[PDB]
Design a protein around this ligand. Structure first.
Ligand SMILES: [Fe+3]
Ligand SMILES: [Fe+3]
Ligand SMILES: [Fe+3]
Ligand SMILES: [Fe+3]
Lengths: 124, 124, 123, 124
């Protein structure tokens, strides 16, 4: 596939999905790349975005929940890696849901292609 | 002007910026629309996105930090407002920042136009 | 498989890729959904975006070329399907390329899930 | 103000709006940065996106027509400016429009901040 699923040893790209809460009709999911072992974030090499998808049990189709773009990577008029602003690739999606189902996240590294992570959403 | 800046009495559109955390050279900034008086989120009327901008003091130009798209609004093959999935218009942007500066957020209601909120990041 | 690849009879979802120009590696690629048999575009049911990916031959990784979001679906303060403005799901991606390779397009319908189309770029 | 409107001399940033076609109730609008004098497109410096907004005359609010992201700027595992792939900052937006009205375009250079362009759609 275009969508890579297994991280290499020394650099992490697979978007990791953490269900922070799922009860009372409401869900909070954090998705990150390189949470424990940071991926580079330079003008030349960085994670550009994460998109989260959710398919409720019994829904014939999945739904895009949302997308987070990480847009600052240090560039400035003074050269690459000079602005002191770098957006970390971690996003929090809050959404209503009524059933459990499957979470899929996609992410993109500007030089290492496309990536997919997956997790079950158990709604209390 | 195109970017509206003062809420109306009954429905809330101005994006609200909150610094949640600033430690270790990383800032976490929450942006939300309607945290207190919730904006509608239906198939026909919803907040589509929030974009955050940061201009460090002394920087000649502002930088986009990132953009969050809130993509689920209830639509399904069964009709509007039936999928049970609605993305809340709240995002958290985690970024490296070296200096105090000005935070500006833009947001969009699909029927009520474009909006802007502003806040100050003070690092000392 | 989240990415559907085969259209239904009555409603068209697969992003169709047309290379308009590939000369001197100045490349224009049009991508559309429902070009000949239009997909609905209402407040309730529409194509929300198309994304184009290109992997040059010899490149170990693919690159996102760009993404086009189609944001207007007739919503207004007067009700659904009243603004008079609807964005058609067609985009043109202009880019430079040095080698031939593989194009992949992705698109999304707010109710019928995710879709993929593929084509070859021959410079 | 954040949205700059007047180009410098050496380098063009203002997005230029052109109505290419208007028939059958559908309008095609091209928006580009640097069509005469091209803006740089390097791993370090590039136009990242253009967004188009349309407000039909008599409509109390504007509508975002759509957004185009130009995501490739030469980065590869071989270093900056080595992939062979660069996305030109030109987009075409095709949309149904019933009425004349005002077109606004926004664009972003990753080191030179935010930009605005304006034009009139005349349908008679
Ligand atoms: Fe990487
Ligand atoms: Fe509203
Ligand atoms: Fe559909
Ligand atoms: Fe520039």
């Amino acid at each position: 596939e275009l969508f890579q699923t297994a991280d290499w040893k020394k650099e992490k790209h697979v978007p990791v999905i953490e269900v922070l809460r799922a009860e009372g009709g409401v869900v909070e999911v954090k998705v990150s790349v390189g949470k424990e072992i940071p991926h580079p974030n330079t003008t030349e090499h960085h994670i550009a975005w994460i998109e989260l998808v959710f398919q409720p049990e019994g829904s014939k189709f999945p739904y895009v929940v949302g997308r987070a773009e990480f847009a600052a990577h240090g560039a400035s008029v003074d050269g690459p890696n000079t602005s002191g602003v770098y957006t970390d690739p971690v996003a929090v999606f809050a959404f209503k849901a009524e059933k459990s189902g499957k979470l899929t996240a996609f992410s993109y590294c500007n030089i290492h292609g496309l990536w997919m992570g997956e997790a079950t959403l158990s709604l209390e």
